[PDB]
Design an enzyme around this catalytic site. Structure first.
Site, PDB file in Angstrom:
ATOM      1  N   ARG B 151       0.777  -1.241  -0.002  1.00 28.97           N
ATOM      2  CA  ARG B 151      -0.066  -0.035  -0.132  1.00 28.97           C
ATOM      3  C   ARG B 151       0.772   1.250   0.052  1.00 28.97           C
ATOM      4  O   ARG B 151       0.260   2.367  -0.114  1.00 28.97           O
ATOM      5  CB  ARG B 151      -0.987   0.146   1.191  1.00 28.97           C
ATOM      6  CG  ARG B 151      -2.301  -0.544   0.992  1.00 28.97           C
ATOM      7  CD  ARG B 151      -2.879  -0.964   2.213  1.00 28.97           C
ATOM      8  NE  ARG B 151      -4.493  -1.014   1.831  1.00 28.97           N
ATOM      9  CZ  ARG B 151      -5.488  -1.997   1.659  1.00 28.97           C
ATOM     10  NH1 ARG B 151      -4.623  -3.116   1.130  1.00 28.97           N
ATOM     11  NH2 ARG B 151      -6.620  -1.916   1.440  1.00 28.97           N
ATOM     12  N   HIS B 327      -7.671 -20.165 -17.635  1.00 28.46           N
ATOM     13  CA  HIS B 327      -8.684 -19.221 -17.149  1.00 28.46           C
ATOM     14  C   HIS B 327     -10.126 -19.823 -17.722  1.00 28.46           C
ATOM     15  O   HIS B 327     -10.337 -19.535 -18.688  1.00 28.46           O
ATOM     16  CB  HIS B 327      -8.660 -17.695 -17.491  1.00 28.46           C
ATOM     17  CG  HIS B 327      -9.417 -17.085 -16.339  1.00 28.46           C
ATOM     18  ND1 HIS B 327      -9.644 -17.001 -15.225  1.00 28.46           N
ATOM     19  CD2 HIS B 327     -10.209 -15.845 -16.516  1.00 28.46           C
ATOM     20  CE1 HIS B 327     -10.079 -16.320 -14.334  1.00 28.46           C
ATOM     21  NE2 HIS B 327     -10.787 -15.532 -15.279  1.00 28.46           N
ATOM     22  N   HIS B 356     -21.132 -24.075 -13.420  1.00 27.95           N
ATOM     23  CA  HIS B 356     -21.421 -22.713 -13.477  1.00 27.95           C
ATOM     24  C   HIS B 356     -21.155 -22.335 -14.859  1.00 27.95           C
ATOM     25  O   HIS B 356     -21.936 -21.554 -15.379  1.00 27.95           O
ATOM     26  CB  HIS B 356     -20.167 -21.922 -12.651  1.00 27.95           C
ATOM     27  CG  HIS B 356     -20.545 -20.695 -12.067  1.00 27.95           C
ATOM     28  ND1 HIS B 356     -20.574 -19.693 -13.019  1.00 27.95           N
ATOM     29  CD2 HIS B 356     -20.498 -20.242 -10.960  1.00 27.95           C
ATOM     30  CE1 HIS B 356     -21.127 -18.655 -12.053  1.00 27.95           C
ATOM     31  NE2 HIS B 356     -20.982 -19.154 -11.080  1.00 27.95           N
ATOM     32  N   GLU B 357     -19.933 -22.768 -15.591  1.00 28.12           N
ATOM     33  CA  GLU B 357     -19.980 -22.445 -17.033  1.00 28.12           C
ATOM     34  C   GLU B 357     -20.894 -22.948 -17.998  1.00 28.12           C
ATOM     35  O   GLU B 357     -21.568 -22.417 -19.064  1.00 28.12           O
ATOM     36  CB  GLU B 357     -18.613 -22.946 -17.528  1.00 28.12           C
ATOM     37  CG  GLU B 357     -17.284 -22.420 -16.822  1.00 28.12           C
ATOM     38  CD  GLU B 357     -17.406 -20.845 -16.746  1.00 28.12           C
ATOM     39  OE1 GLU B 357     -17.699 -20.184 -17.589  1.00 28.12           O
ATOM     40  OE2 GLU B 357     -17.075 -20.367 -15.550  1.00 28.12           O
ATOM     41  N   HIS B 487     -10.575  -3.657  -9.527  1.00 28.07           N
ATOM     42  CA  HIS B 487     -11.845  -2.857 -10.119  1.00 28.07           C
ATOM     43  C   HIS B 487     -11.842  -1.365  -9.403  1.00 28.07           C
ATOM     44  O   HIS B 487     -12.849  -1.048  -8.973  1.00 28.07           O
ATOM     45  CB  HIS B 487     -13.048  -3.595  -9.925  1.00 28.07           C
ATOM     46  CG  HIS B 487     -13.050  -5.051 -10.211  1.00 28.07           C
ATOM     47  ND1 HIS B 487     -12.732  -5.789  -9.152  1.00 28.07           N
ATOM     48  CD2 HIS B 487     -13.278  -5.626 -11.129  1.00 28.07           C
ATOM     49  CE1 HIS B 487     -12.606  -6.903  -9.567  1.00 28.07           C
ATOM     50  NE2 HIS B 487     -12.974  -7.231 -11.026  1.00 28.07           N
ATOM     51  N   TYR B 497     -21.549  -7.053  -7.776  1.00 32.93           N
ATOM     52  CA  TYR B 497     -21.460  -8.009  -7.129  1.00 32.93           C
ATOM     53  C   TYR B 497     -22.417  -7.992  -5.709  1.00 32.93           C
ATOM     54  O   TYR B 497     -22.562  -8.904  -5.007  1.00 32.93           O
ATOM     55  CB  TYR B 497     -19.822  -7.943  -6.537  1.00 32.93           C
ATOM     56  CG  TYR B 497     -19.054  -7.948  -7.505  1.00 32.93           C
ATOM     57  CD1 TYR B 497     -18.739  -9.167  -8.464  1.00 32.93           C
ATOM     58  CD2 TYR B 497     -18.278  -6.978  -7.906  1.00 32.93           C
ATOM     59  CE1 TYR B 497     -18.091  -9.167  -9.455  1.00 32.93           C
ATOM     60  CE2 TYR B 497     -17.143  -6.996  -8.947  1.00 32.93           C
ATOM     61  CZ  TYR B 497     -17.164  -8.089  -9.632  1.00 32.93           C
ATOM     62  OH  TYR B 497     -16.240  -7.881 -10.631  1.00 32.93           O
TER      63      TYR B 497
END
Ligand SMILES: *[C@@H]1O[C@H](CO)[C@@H](O[C@@H]2O[C@H](CO)[C@@H](O)[C@H](O)[C@H]2NC(C)=O)[C@H](O)[C@H]1NC(C)=O
Ligand SMILES: *[C@@H]1O[C@H](CO)[C@@H](O[C@@H]2O[C@H](CO)[C@@H](O)[C@H](O)[C@H]2NC(C)=O)[C@H](O)[C@H]1NC(C)=O
Ligand SMILES: *[C@@H]1O[C@H](CO)[C@@H](O[C@@H]2O[C@H](CO)[C@@H](O)[C@H](O)[C@H]2NC(C)=O)[C@H](O)[C@H]1NC(C)=O
Ligand SMILES: *[C@@H]1O[C@H](CO)[C@@H](O[C@@H]2O[C@H](CO)[C@@H](O)[C@H](O)[C@H]2NC(C)=O)[C@H](O)[C@H]1NC(C)=O
Ligand SMILES: *[C@@H]1O[C@H](CO)[C@@H](O[C@@H]2O[C@H](CO)[C@@H](O)[C@H](O)[C@H]2NC(C)=O)[C@H](O)[C@H]1NC(C)=O
Ligand SMILES: *[C@@H]1O[C@H](CO)[C@@H](O)[C@H](O)[C@H]1NC(C)=O
Ligand SMILES: *[C@@H]1O[C@H](CO)[C@@H](O)[C@H](O)[C@H]1NC(C)=O
Ligand SMILES: *[C@@H]1O[C@H](CO)[C@@H](O)[C@H](O)[C@H]1NC(C)=O
Lengths: 201, 596
Positions: B151, B327, B356-357, B487, B497
């Site tokens: 950070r 991926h 899921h896919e 993001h 989300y």
């Protein structure tokens, strides 16, 4: 006598290349004997629909001449080749009368027409001022004018090229793969009948 | 002349070129991803930019048809998307500067290097390594060191860039008749069509915390239990009255609490449900996993996968020099081309990922009949929720025992159910406050409510107020901690989300209700249920044609977004936690700090 002088169905169903849908190829069959048993019993045809007459009784009745219209269209676009149907093909490319009698045969040809880089040799009309009358062919390439501003044969704001090309590729899914279509239409003009089926011996 | 009739011809002309150009671009991208080589790069670019160029020219045409005279809702909605100027409203000097600043921010974020003082010759990266340091380790000094290094060596140069980026993007948004850049991001949750289904950009702001105040009672008990477990693990480091530090959560930023499951397991003797040994013993290859995944959707009632998916898609084993990215992705190349990309192995996680896919692919196949510009979900929260529903419904012990993967004499009891529910809660409900806080801070800073100097002091003082996380070390103004996230510097919205989680549970509860299931919600299964397959299919096929308010009417009873099902899903966990942290304090006080 023995079956002889068979109609040349080989040069129609086994042609090297087919014409585009907007310029469908018309062949006249007359003064010969036609064998529909081999066509009906063949398992290579995905779609085989006869409207005016029953397919099993084709070899009995006989007419004076036949017209074979051959072209290539999309996969899901086959259902538009039927009486009383609407769409881009049934209105601008190929129109069938409501009282149509004959047969329609369509089979997949993805291993021949499709190319890995894209086959752009097949075209179809997308824009037209008015619908087509049954059995009418139009090959004009004049610039369509959607708006009110005249176009001197040049595309622009509201002027488009009527013809658009297919993009057939081997990786296309079912319904977008090329399909070869042949339509048989029988005419019964009062002239003496010539195209008649074989007499079984 | 008329404008309504002559716009349909323009749209029809646009679609024909858009379809094949997008197909070529997607094919080039897939070829590059499957086969990483120098030759297959330029070609991809040689398509990509060209596609973008197309979307330029047509846009210049779309402005020639006024939008105040179109009466058809579908035509107006389809034309509105094309009429957006995008970033092409500013001058070239400012646009090129914006592109350069975005590119340099993206490059700087992916070039992290921090060397510890004792040996300055070994730096690590955000890839496994520095990320692994605080992902699986039990120590206080090294985690704090890694946190501060990341950070203070990656976030101390993004601040001057972000300061100009904020104002430049705000001016660009104001040039598009939006009061700020917040409305641009909230514009996708807006409809002004059918009467009674109207939604506004400013309504979402009031609707976010209204459905958040009902989760605080559930979140507080989880916070107290986690704090008690951390106290039992870390002695004399967490005050019982106050809250927990920042670097002890288990991740770089504390987005997820999954890594903390080992320390805070309810029962240790009772093991979890693992079928990997049964997978290996029965010799299940990668094809069997996808066949079983297909069987689920066939049983539900959804259509079967097309032939060609088994041929073109790279299912497994990149193997030799033919390198590829591992991926997991689902590709919709258009023209009826659907593919998958995965490096499948023998694991339950791979089983759930395949489910899921497959759900993603089914949803993509659902709306294939819509026009080109309407082949998307109603909003950003529907697609991933539909993807996650299948993963939720395929992990129950009943489904595993039905497919002959678990012993038929299984005797599940209190312990395993509580363990599994707590494991899921550590991931699902533990991330909502973080997302809410981040989106609220971004909206406030875009709106200009907080000035330049009030950047690093408002962020922490709302983190402690909402999430209950303190700063291990005081950060002055010259830090830019929020930008140290994926993001936040790549210009990605983060509110998706939050709504996705609520939509997931609303859909699951609706299906379970219309599946004739009796008992707790966490054991519900939608397999073998045809009636539950139709109800979903009525909303999958709509695509973007209809407003999302109407989309939330063919599945659930009401069109609003209320968190009812989450409070019922974790009901046994809530009632166990009520009797667990009885001899402790529930809540946090924002006065105690680790450094003072
Ligand atoms: C086009 O040519 C083929 C030749 O391969 C014809 O196929 C016939 O029928 C089967 C198919 O394999 C085989 O017996 C032969 O290949 C062919 N001959 C005979 C006598 O059957 C096909 O019939 C031709 N198409 C036509 C005539 O429309
Ligand atoms: C907006 O235009 C679309 C496209 O024409 C209309 O959708 C058609 O609606 C008719 C109504 O019966 C159907 O028969 C067609 O199948 C629909 N699709 C097409 C491609 O024509 C829609 O109804 C129009 N909306 C209006 C007028 O409010
Ligand atoms: C997108 O950019 C165009 C181009 O500047 C904008 O169109 C201008 O709008 C203003 C305000 O109505 C007019 O005074 C100009 O004459 C327009 N210019 C042109 C070339 O038409 C448009 O407003 C921008 N925003 C959109 C389309 O939403
Ligand atoms: C998708 O699944 C359906 C349902 O099983 C298949 O439809 C039939 O499946 C049975 C058993 O697999 C076959 O014996 C039939 O021949 C199938 N009927 C038809 C008309 O195909 C369907 O074939 C499957 N699709 C794919 C691409 O595998
Ligand atoms: C409903 O789920 C049950 C549970 O698996 C399925 O029953 C199995 O059916 C197969 C053959 O189809 C048998 O080999 C298994 O032994 C059955 N299992 C049990 C536990 O009975 C049933 O097929 C499913 N129904 C549908 C329509 O898919
Ligand atoms: C018909 O075929 C048979 C057998 O080949 C032959 O004997 C006969 O002569 C043929 N008829 C004619 C008219 O050619
Ligand atoms: C991958 O790309 C390389 C170089 O472009 C080429 O030689 C090879 O044949 C490709 N492999 C496949 C499977 O396309
Ligand atoms: C499960 O919980 C109930 C409720 O207290 C208890 O009566 C029962 O003994 C428990 N069973 C097990 C196996 O722990």
């Amino acid at each position: 006598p023995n079956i002889t002088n068979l109609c040349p169905f080989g040069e129609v169903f086994n042609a090297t290349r087919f014409a585009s849908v907007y310029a469908w190829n018309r062949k006249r069959i007359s003064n010969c004997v036609a064998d529909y048993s081999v066509l009906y019993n063949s398992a290579s045809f995905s779609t085989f629909k006869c409207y005016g007459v029953s397919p099993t009784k084709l070899n009995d009745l006989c007419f004076t001449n036949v017209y074979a219209d051959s072209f290539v269209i999309r996969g899901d676009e086959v259902r538009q080749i039927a009486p009383g149907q609407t769409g881009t093909i049934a209105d601008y490319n190929y129109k069938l009368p409501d009282d149509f009698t004959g047969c329609v045969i369509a089979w997949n040809s993805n291993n021949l027409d499709s190319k890995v880089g894209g086959n752009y040799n097949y075209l179809y009309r997308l824009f037209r001022k008015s619908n087509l009358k049954p059995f009418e062919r139009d090959i004009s390439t004049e610039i369509y004018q959607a708006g009110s501003t005249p176009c001197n044969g040049v595309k622009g704001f509201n002027c488009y090229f009527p013809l658009q090309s297919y993009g057939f590729q081997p990786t296309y899914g079912v319904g977008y793969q090329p399909y070869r279509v042949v339509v048989l239409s029988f005419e019964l003009l009062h002239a003496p009948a010539t195209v008649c089926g074989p007499k079984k011996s | 002349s008329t404008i309504e009739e002559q716009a349909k011809t323009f749209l029809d002309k646009f679609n024909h070129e858009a379809e094949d150009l997008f197909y070529q671009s997607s094919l080039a991208s897939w070829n590059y991803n499957t086969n990483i080589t120098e030759e297959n790069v330029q070609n991809m670019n040689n398509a990509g930019d060209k596609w973008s160029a197309f979307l330029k020219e047509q846009s210049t045409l779309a402005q020639m048809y006024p939008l105040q005279e179109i009466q058809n809702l579908t035509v107006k909605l389809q034309l509105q998307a094309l009429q957006q100027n995008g970033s092409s409203v500013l001058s070239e000097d400012k646009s090129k500067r914006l592109n350069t600043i975005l590119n340099t921010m993206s490059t700087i974020y992916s070039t992290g290097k921090v060397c510890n003082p004792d040996n300055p010759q070994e730096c690590l990266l955000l890839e496994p390594g520095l990320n692994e340091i605080m992902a699986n380790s039990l120590d206080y000094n090294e985690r704090l060191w890694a946190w501060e290094s990341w950070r203070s060596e990656v976030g101390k140069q993004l601040r001057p860039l972000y300061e100009e980026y904020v104002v430049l993007k705000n001016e660009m948004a104001r040039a598009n008749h939006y009061e700020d850049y917040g409305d641009y991001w909230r514009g996708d949750y807006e409809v002004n069509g059918v009467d009674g289904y109207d939604y506004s950009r400013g309504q979402l702001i009031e609707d976010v915390e209204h459905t958040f105040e009902e989760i605080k009672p559930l979140y507080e008990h989880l916070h107290a239990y986690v704090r008690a477990k951390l106290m039992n693990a870390y002695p004399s480091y967490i005050s019982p009255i106050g809250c927990l530090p920042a670097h002890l959560l288990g991740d770089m930023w504390g987005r997820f609490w999954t890594n903390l499951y080992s320390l805070t397991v309810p029962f240790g003797q009772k093991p979890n449900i693992d079928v990997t040994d049964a997978m290996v013993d029965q010799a299940w290859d990668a094809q069997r996993i996808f066949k079983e995944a297909e069987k689920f959707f066939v049983s539900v009632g959804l259509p079967n996968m097309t032939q060609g998916f088994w041929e073109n898609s790279m299912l497994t084993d990149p193997g030799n020099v033919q390198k590829a990215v591992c991926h997991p992705t689902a590709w919709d190349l258009g023209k009826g081309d659907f593919r998958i990309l995965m490096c499948t192995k023998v694991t339950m996680d791979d089983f759930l990922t395949a489910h899921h896919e497959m759900g993603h692919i089914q949803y993509d196949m659902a709306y294939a009949a819509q026009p080109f510009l309407l082949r998307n979900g109603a909003n950003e929260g529907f697609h991933e929720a539909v993807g996650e529903i299948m993963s939720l419904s395929a992990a129950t012990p009943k489904h595993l025992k039905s497919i002959g993967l678990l012993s038929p004499d299984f005797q599940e009891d209190n312990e395993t159910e509580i363990n599994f529910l707590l494991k899921q809660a550590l991931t699902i409900v533990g991330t909502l406050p973080f997302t809410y806080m981040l989106e609220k801070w971004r909206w406030m800073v875009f709106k200009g409510e907080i000035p330049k100097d009030q950047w690093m002091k408002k962020w922490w003082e709302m983190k402690r107020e909402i999430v209950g996380v303190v700063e291990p070390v005081p950060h002055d103004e010259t830090y830019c901690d929020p930008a140290s996230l994926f993001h936040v510097s790549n210009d990605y919205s983060f509110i998706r989300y939050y709504t996705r989680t609520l939509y997931q549970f609303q859909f699951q509860e609706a299906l379970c209700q219309a599946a004739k299931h009796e008992g707790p919600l966490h054991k519900c299964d939608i397999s073998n249920s045809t009636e539950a397959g139709q109800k979903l299919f009525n909303m999958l096929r709509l695509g973007k044609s209809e407003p999302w308010t109407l989309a939330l009417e063919n599945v659930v009873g009401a069109k609003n977004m209320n968190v009812r099902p989450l409070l019922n899903y974790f009901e046994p966990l809530f009632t166990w936690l009520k009797d667990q942290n009885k001899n402790s304090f529930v809540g946090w006080s924002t006065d105690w700090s680790p450094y003072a």
